[PDB]
Assembly symmetry: C5
Homo-oligomer: 69 residues x 5
């Protein structure tokens, strides 16, 4: 899967349909994987750098692959 964005998590958003939105770099992407919610929030709080991999690399795109550094 191609890299989409790398950077710190600016903010996260819990959505009405239980999906989770994240803003990294200049893209706002979302995931339907529930396991990622607490993982992404921890990364936001501790200031980790994440790389999100997805073919839908555009605002509103989905992802399910993340690298925590």
């Amino acid at each position: 899967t191609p890299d989409c964005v790398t950077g710190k998590v600016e903010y996260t958003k819990y959505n009405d349909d239980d999906t989770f939105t994240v803003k990294v770099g200049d893209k706002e992407l979302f995931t339907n994987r529930w396991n990622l919610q607490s993982l992404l929030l921890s990364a936001q709080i501790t200031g980790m750098t994440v790389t999100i991999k997805t073919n839908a690399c555009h605002n509103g795109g989905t992802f399910s692959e993340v690298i925590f550094r």
Copy 2:
């Protein structure tokens, strides 16, 4: 969904019916989304600023959308 309140979490409450209550700003709101429980407590502990979006923007109103800044 319109913004309702923005601020730090003053306190949280675990309810008898397994719902979760949060006090942000001047509104006391609750959610039935179990996933939000640990996320909201983490936000409380680390002192994050949260934005709750909901049409039921009044005390005792419900929500399921939260932005963690």
Copy 3:
């Protein structure tokens, strides 16, 4: 539901039947809500003040309502 005890969490105990015991103030109370286990341990570790609301306000009594401050 009436307030029972308020104070820091002195200690927590995981029970053989998967219920969770907590000692706040002078009372030792237990809950069968699994969601409360990690929340209460976090409150103990971070030194939060909790308020437990219950009608069974006596040693060995049950609760399912907690305010985290």
Copy 4:
């Protein structure tokens, strides 16, 4: 249930059958309660003193009761 060991968590081990092993004092014990996994790791990380209560108080013995202080 009788006290078995008291002290800090020296190390923990995730096992192949999804049980969790903990080394407290001079005993290595394990539990099959999934709820205890994150609780025990938190206790290891923060340096809490734990008391494990069990009748099988010997290396390789099982437990399901823990006191966190």
Copy 5:
């Protein structure tokens, strides 16, 4: 199960199929145990030394046993 690698977690990766990848030492290994996801991230954040035991000790190999020191 024989020791494979020992060291700090360089990075973790959430995979498309809900498995979890970890890089320790010079090996990149993955696990299908969901319970290990938050445990491993906590280990990465706090800088613990972990020992991964597995017979599939090579890049892309699987594991389900971890010692958290």
